[PDB]
Structures are given as structure tokens and as C-alpha cells.
Symmetry: D2
């Protein structure tokens, strides 16, 4: 039973990090695909040597052809133009990639990163024909990583012991659910009651979370290390059948009162892809914000067509 | 620099697994101490060879003298007779061990496993003179691992994505708190509302959790693999300054309306030992069960003296 | 893919360690099989809880039925009586286990631990009908771990930076090859010439390596932790297609001038099982020792056959 | 107790990968230091979020001040000129960067001496064997506490290429490249093993040919150039090699790793740094292993050292 084959459609900064992490974790053979000539081969060569340091045995190859999607177990899509004017252009890219997925790897697990993700993931779902349980978009794992981390540094606890939920869409309409924040499994409100962190501090953290991509772009460049790690967490849960509860963009079929659209919600990721879609029991305020996120996704989807 | 020194006071079944895991994780040099002659040297020799398989470099040594406590960074006490008649006998074991700790490693971080833990950890605290933030008892990490695991199997999610709190005492008066169970950070109640698990199933799991040690004894022996892993999780948090929120038996100084006694509650474990003691905001009914647990610890503490 | 299924035929102390390490490494679901009713279920329950501590998701189940070999990807055989009087008794056990492997998992990767391993592995091969690339015996990984570790102590280097080769058979006739010892890839002779370790010290280490099991038993302990870790290293190389070079008991078909017998030699373990069998280019002195090891394996196999 | 503090002097592509791997392995708190404004803070912020995914707790911060060297346990220097400022590719050569990077080593060395005189220093600035000695001289750090990257990176290429011809786990190939990190690197064919077995046995069995090896050797020496010619650049493997060295130090692993270290008579050389196997543990360079080289190998070692000396003379 051979290694998983993981094809990275897009070999930019996020691609490079993903390939690095895949080798570190010995997750599978890697293809770095890009339309840019030669570059993916150079990155692939550089990364391949790290098998020695990592005590791994993963092949890492570059590619300039979609034909290398053949036999892929996991496809991660970061390719795309980098706002509203790009929607129809990136739709065409999803049509192209989707057609190649359909013929080369129709049973692959597909993770879409191309922004705006909630729109682009549905466009690829439609153009590739893959089942709803085998395609998801990056969102909540990345967004909550910021919220979890910032709260952890205020409370002086292990970052992953903060859990949190951000839903609806990946972008400015992301819905931060204060009521669903826990610290070591304990409601955050208890820490607020004890004066360990204030409502004002939290509002500042919420604002920072929403604007993190902009903050980092202003300082340096579009974030890529945390996005890569978030994607690999998702990919690993699939490949190792870990059944982790992770927030991703997934097809809504009545959840939150919505359908024929993708939105961010907790899901269980295992060997069968999206094994469960978990509908949070939202109150009216939270729901209202969820609906606003979906409306913005629907608006941009209309423009993409 | 140099490596941590971890002394296992008791080289029985739990000790053997601890030494194995320490080498796997390259956590520090190990001393397997026991009153039984030769045996700890034999287990140490066997375990030491696993450095090759593990790509680690941890010394593993046997000992029959408390002088090997000299320079210990972590001390883990599993020694003791294995009910109420044993309390004064194990009190004398805690007096002996405490005296040697005070002499050889007064600044070590101490983890007590000797049952009943909540009593024995306080006795060792009093006889060793160590600070209250440097001595804890095994309890909630082990007890909650059972609860978390059983729920994860019913819901088909990653075991560690279930978080749960069991407090008060490690033993038959352990307090299982339904309200503080989460799944991927989502309250367990949501899953109950969705009919994914019933309250009857949950009650059965609660009963199974309380009686797990007995169940395992009736099939084999007093559990040792999970206890060992739970202890190493705690020791690792200390040694690597992870600041994990872990439930342990710790000195209460007013929390839950109790003092001059040790009880199970969530704490933060990092380089400074017990960095925080977290008091759950229990309702009156939960608090009443907590008081029953403490009452029993106090009852047995009186008999120990 | 769904997880690998690993069936431990024998759930003694060695099995417990194997199950523990499998969960730590998230290597696959685990079945603790044994011929006593309750114990494997007890051990399985205890170990299953460690998924929480390990952030793993491996099922750990007890079993009293060979039907649980169905769907097995790896089968690790430690069952048997625990000297030459035991040979035909354990052969009878290999006949039964081999029959159930043939029936339930004819293409599983089989690792045999039951002593004497070079005899027992061939017996199971014959009684199971599994291909020669899918059945190996524990030996060299364990024996060399001892030699590697003791040398590393003397020289004060990382234990795994010592590499060494012990071949022929797992047991008292094991052939320690001084010529194939390296430290960080550097021949050990350089360290001897430099007076960092002496020939006398090395001889003592060789003696200690051969007698390690006896030493541990004389210390009122039982050797099972390192044997378990060695077996898991082998199983992992197979399951993750690492293609590690590991010394295991394997079917010889001409190598070293021997055939129709299993002996210890470096092999490459990957997704196709034994992908390569590496024959060390031994000199006449080393060859003669190898021959003594094989002769002893043949002697014991004759006592085992029915 | 508490965590090690690791300061990355230089927050470029190698720095970025290093920070990522440090968090993955929970090795220590990280400081991304650079002269460039804002960028190290942005990289640090991005990387810090990965603590959640990795179940780690390493602080990652950006810095534009040498004050952050205070309390450093490990200092990794990737800073330096890789091209002549404002010059086109045709009017500078490698030798021109030597006196410029000397001045950088003087500056960094002075701040190390002031702020962390006993930190473990790993120098990556090319050509390493020159620059590590310059930093040693300008910082006054003890000889057991300063090393240069070379052999771990160069051998990873050779080990990897051989492994894919022989179809074995990459790390089961062991190999030694010594003398210097650069075009004069000395590939020791005689010392290559595969699962501890001399490579020659595999050549004897026709599993790989002398010609194949010779092509592999040439590819190893020219890998950096091959990667640059493919419109990429080598920073992932360099970062992983550096972290393997730092990890051996911080975890007291006592791994045998080939690094640039001060020679005090080994191979007949002194007052110079060169690549040789060392043992890295809690006391830094715990052992310097002198290989018993034959004449052809010794000749190439001497050539590598002569080139390092030539470049050092220009750097001064
Ligand atoms: Ca984004
Ligand atoms: Ca108990
Ligand atoms: Ca044996
Ligand atoms: Ca270079």
C-alpha cells in the first residue's frame, strides 16, 4: 500500500512551507505544481534533501503540467490571481483545475485556499464534480489559530489549550463566537469573571484577529507560514484518519437555514473526508452575523459567474 | 544545560512504562529506584537500549538508594503498599521519602501517585517541606482520559478533541462535571440535543469511568500504561514549560471554600511548577459533590496520622 | 486510506510495550490477541486511554479469536512456550498460527519473535504459505541495539550514531562483525587506533552483547522493552515505506553459500516487505562463524520438525 | 527551565524556515532579528500562530536591535552580502564580498561579545569557513561555542542522491564531506556507507556504478547552482541542517555532525576553521574527530584549507 500522493497546485510561499512540513511529518510524496517554469523543480530539489534531516522518505518533485494530478490522494489549491474584478478570472482558473481533477483524480480529497475561499471552493466543487464530502476550503483553522494564540498569551497558557470558533466565511465577515471560547475546556467567561482578561482586551483581540492578514501584509507580505500549517493539519487529519474537529468551508445543505452555498463550520475530518458537519446551536445575534457572511459569499459568487 | 534528571521512586509496572516513554520523548536521564534488589537495574538496562530505536540520548539507571535523588529535577512517587489499614503504613513511606527529598532535591518538582493520592500528596508535601507549587498528585489527567476516550468512541471523533473535567478527588468520590464536557470546543450538550449521544449513554460512560481501575483489575491488574502516560504528560508540561491546563491534586487555599487540604482541580503546569490554580465556578449541586470528595480525603488523612 | 491493522499474536509484556508504542506513533489500529480470555482485553482497555495523551486515534482491542487476523496488514508473533524440549511444541503452535494466517491474512507482513527465531520464522513460513518477502524474524535490530548502545556509552556519542552488524542467527551463535562497526559513519578502527576505545574493551562489549538477555534475567528483570521497540522499528519501516536497512532473519537463497534456511542479514524493508536482501561480502573468518550459526539453526529445526 | 532563547541574526528565507522548524519542534523562544524594518515582526507574527497547530509554546518575536542578543542561548548568523550593492551580475565576483562581510562580522561579533559572550554561535554567512573564524576573532567566544554550517548540508545532498539510486531510506546513507563548504568541498568516497555497509560492496554488486557516483559527486558540489538556475534558491535544506545542529546542542544529543570548527593541529593545520566531524552536545563542540585520511583525501583537504586561507587574507 504505497505512500499518499499530495499535489500542491500552486508552489508559492504557502506551497513551499506545505512541502517542508509534509516531509517533516513524512505524510506522503509531494508534487509542487506551478505555471511558473522551472521554479517548482528548484523548490522541490531543495526540499527533497530535508528527508535526510527529518529521517523521512517522501519524494518531492516539481511540475508544470496538470497531468501530474494523476493518482493524487490530496490536492491543495493555492493558485489564483491576487478585488471583485478577479472573481471571474479566478472562476476560469477553477474551471481549468476542476476539469483536470475530474479526469486525473476524481477521488482525491481537495483543499481550496484561493481567495475568497468560500466562493472559490464551491466553484471548484461544481467544475470538478467531486463529492461534497471530499472538498473543503481553508478558513476557521487559520482564523481561530490567531484568536487562540492571542488569548493564550494574555492568559499565559499553552496556545492549543485555548479553543475557539470562527464561522460563516473566511474574510472580513468572519463570525467570532465569544460564547464558544474555552481555556483548557473551561468557558472563557469564567476567566473574565475572575478578572484574568477584560471584555475590552478581548474586543481588541477580536479586532486584531479579523485584521491579521492586513497587519502582516503591511509589515511584510501575505501570511504563509500559518496558512500552510493550518492546511497540513487538515490534510493530516484526513490522511491519518484522526477525525479531528476542525472548522472548514463546506457545503451547507440546510444547516443554519442555508443551502447551495459553502460556509465555515466545524467538521470532522477522517479517512472518509468530511465525516460530519457540525451545526452550532447559535443564538439570534450569532446567527444574524452568520447570515451576513453567507450573503457576502453569495454576492461575490454572483460576480464570479 | 544539562539534561533534566528524573527519578522514579517505585520501579513497578507504572515506573517501567514511564522510563520507556521518557526515552521515547528524550525527556531526561532516568533513575529507576526501588527497594527490591537488582530488578530496577535489569529494567534500566533493557530500557536503555531503546535509545537506539528512539534516536534519543537519555541515561537509564537502576538504584536501591535514595542518594540517587541528588540533583533530581523531577521526582515521581509510585511506591507504597497496595484499604484504610495501609494509610498509616504509607504515611511512614511518605515520611521516609520526604526526608530524603528535603535533603537531596528540595527544589525538585514532585508528582505523587501513591493511593489515595489526595491524602498521600499532602503527607509528602508536609514531610518534604517543598513549596506548594512544586508538588502535585496524579488524578484528573488519568480519570478524564477515560471519560474523554469513551465519549470520543461514541461520537467518532479524535479522543483528544474531547475535553472534560473531573475534580475533587482521585477515587470513588471523583466529581464528573457534565457541564464542562466539550467536543472540539463545542459543549457536549449540543451533541445530546442532536441525539448523537443520549443521557443514558452518558451516565453509563460516567459509571464506567469511575470504575475503570476495577474493570481492568477484574480483567488483568491495576492499570499502568495510561497512568504512566498521564504522569509523563504532566512532567513534560513542567520540563518543557508548555503551560498546559491539566487537572491535578493541588493544595487548596480557599478555592471551593476549602483549605489545608489537597484536591483535584485544573492547574497550569510550566517551568515554575503550578503556575496557576484554576477554580471552576461550580453551581451549588456540583459544589456539594466536591465537598463530599474533600470530606473523604480529610477522613482518610485523619486515619493516616 | 483507513488505518493499518496490526495484530499482536501474543499479548505478554512485549505485546503491551508494542501496543503502547503503536499508539504513541499513531501507527495503526491494534489487536492484542492471546490464548487467555481476560488479560488481552484488560491491557487493550488500559492502552486505549493513551490515545488522549498521545493525540492519536488508534483502536486497541483485545481478542481471543484468530478470526481477528482478517484484514491484518502486520502480524507479530510472540506466542509460544517459554530448552530444546520446547522446539516441537512451539512448531505445533506455528502449525496452528500458520493455518489461520493462510486462511485469514495470506498477504499480511509477518514478524516472528518466538525463540529460537531463525527456526520458528521458517517453520511459520512453511506452515502459512506466505511469500518469502512477507515474513521475517526479529534478531539483528535488537542485538545490534545492545552493541550500538554500549559502544556509544564508551565514546560519549549519540547511540544511534553507532552502526553495527550482527548476522547469522539470533542467539548465542550470533556473529558480531567488528569490521562493520561505524561511529558517525566512521570506521570504529579509527577510534581504536586513536586509543579512544581498546580491543579489550570491545571484546568485553561483544561478550556483554551476546549475554545481555541473561544479564537482565539475572537482575530479576525480563527483557521485553527493547525487543518491543526493535519490532516496532521494523513494522514502521514496512507500514510507512521507509526502506530502512535493518538486520532481520530472512530466507537465504544462496547468500553466504546457504539455502533452504532463514538467517540474519541486512534487508531493506518497505511497502513491498523485504525489498532487498543484502549479502555482506564477508571474509573467510567471518564466513566460518556464519556457518556455525546456520548449523545450529539447522540442528534445532530438525528437533522441531514433526 | 525556562526555554532556550534562539536569536536568528538575519531574518531572510533561511531565517524564516528556521523559525518555522523551531516552533514545530518546540525547541525554544525565537527572535527574528534584521536591519530591515517591519519584516521580522511580520514573519514573527505569522510564525507565532503555528504554536496552535504544532501544540508548542515558543514565543516568536521580531527585532531590529542587538539588545535582543541579551540572554541568547543560540545565535544563528545568516546575515551578510550575497551580491555587491548596486552592481550589475557581470562586474562583481565572490571575492569582492569578502571585505564587506568581514565588516559585518566585526559588527555582529562586537555585539555578541557585549551581549552574549558564551552563547552557542552557528555561522552561515558564506564562505562559511572564513566568516566563522572572523566572527570568532571579533567576538571572543570560546572555540567550543562557535561553529559553521557545511557538512550537514552538503552531505544531505550526497546522502539523498545515493539513496534514490539504491532505493533506501535517505538517512541510512552516511557520508562525509570535509575541508570547506564551497567548491573545494572534499567528498570522501571511501567513507560512504549504506546502512553501515561500505558503499564499495554495492558497487561490487553492480547496484550503482563508479560513473553514476561521479555524476552524483558533481551534482552534490553544484547543487546550490542547480537550484539557482531553476529560478529557485536553496534555503529549506540549509535551514533544516542548521536546526539539526542547534537541536543536538540544545537536547544534548551528542550527534556526530560535520561542521566548520577551529583546527588546532588536526590534519596538520592550525589557526584556521575547516569542516570535520564533531560531537555536538550541551557543552558545545565536545569532541573534534580527526579522520585518518589517505594521501589523495589529505591533498584535497589541504586544497580546501588553502582556499579558505586565501579568502581570509582578502577578507582582512
Ligand atoms: Ca485570507
Ligand atoms: Ca487509582
Ligand atoms: Ca532472544
Ligand atoms: Ca553555500
Amino acid at each position: 500500500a504505497p505512500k499518499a500522493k499530495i499535489v500542491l497546485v500552486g508552489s508559492g510561499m504557502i506551497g513551499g512551507v506545505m512541502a517542508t512540513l509534509i516531509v517533516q511529518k513524512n505524510l506522503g510524496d509531494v508534487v509542487l505544481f506551478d505555471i511558473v517554469k522551472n521554479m517548482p523543480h528548484g523548490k522541490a530539489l531543495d526540499t527533497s534533501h530535508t528527508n535526510v534531516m527529518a529521517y523521512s522518505n517522501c519524494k518531492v518533485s516539481g511540475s508544470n503540467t496538470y497531468d501530474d494530478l494523476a493518482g493524487a490522494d490530496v490536492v491543495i489549491v493555492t493558485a489564483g490571481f491576487t478585488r471583485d474584478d478577479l472573481l471571474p478570472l479566478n472562476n476560469k482558473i477553477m474551471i481549468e483545475i476542476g476539469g483536470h481533477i475530474k479526469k486525473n483524480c476524481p477521488n482525491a480529497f481537495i483543499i481550496v485556499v484561493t481567495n475568497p475561499v468560500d466562493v472559490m471552493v464551491q466553484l471548484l466543487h461544481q467544475h470538478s464534480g467531486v463529492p461534497k464530502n471530499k472538498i473543503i476550503g481553508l478558513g476557521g483553522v487559520l482564523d481561530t489559530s490567531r484568536l487562540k494564540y492571542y488569548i493564550s498569551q494574555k492568559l499565559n497558557v499553552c496556545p492549543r489549550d485555548v479553543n475557539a470558533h470562527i464561522v460563516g466565511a473566511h474574510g472580513n465577515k468572519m463570525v467570532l463566537l465569544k460564547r464558544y471560547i474555552t481555556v483548557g475546556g473551561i468557558p472563557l467567561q469564567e476567566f473574565i469573571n475572575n478578572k484574568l482578561i477584560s471584555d475590552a482586551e478581548l474586543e481588541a483581540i477580536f479586532d486584531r484577529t479579523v485584521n491579521t492578514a492586513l497587519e502582516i501584509v503591511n509589515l511584510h507580505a501575505s501570511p504563509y507560514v500559518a496558512p500552510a500549517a493550518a492546511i497540513i493539519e487538515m490534510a493530516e487529519s484526513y490522511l491519518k484518519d484522526l477525525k479531528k474537529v476542525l472548522i472548514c468551508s463546506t457545503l451547507l445543505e440546510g444547516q443554519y437555514g442555508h443551502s447551495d452555498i459553502f460556509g465555515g463550520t466545524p467538521v470532522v475530518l477522517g479517512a472518509n473526508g468530511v465525516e460530519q458537519v457540525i451545526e452550532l446551536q447559535l443564538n439570534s445575534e450569532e446567527k444574524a452575523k452568520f447570515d451576513e457572511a453567507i450573503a457576502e459569499t453569495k454576492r461575490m459568487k454572483a460576480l464570479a459567474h
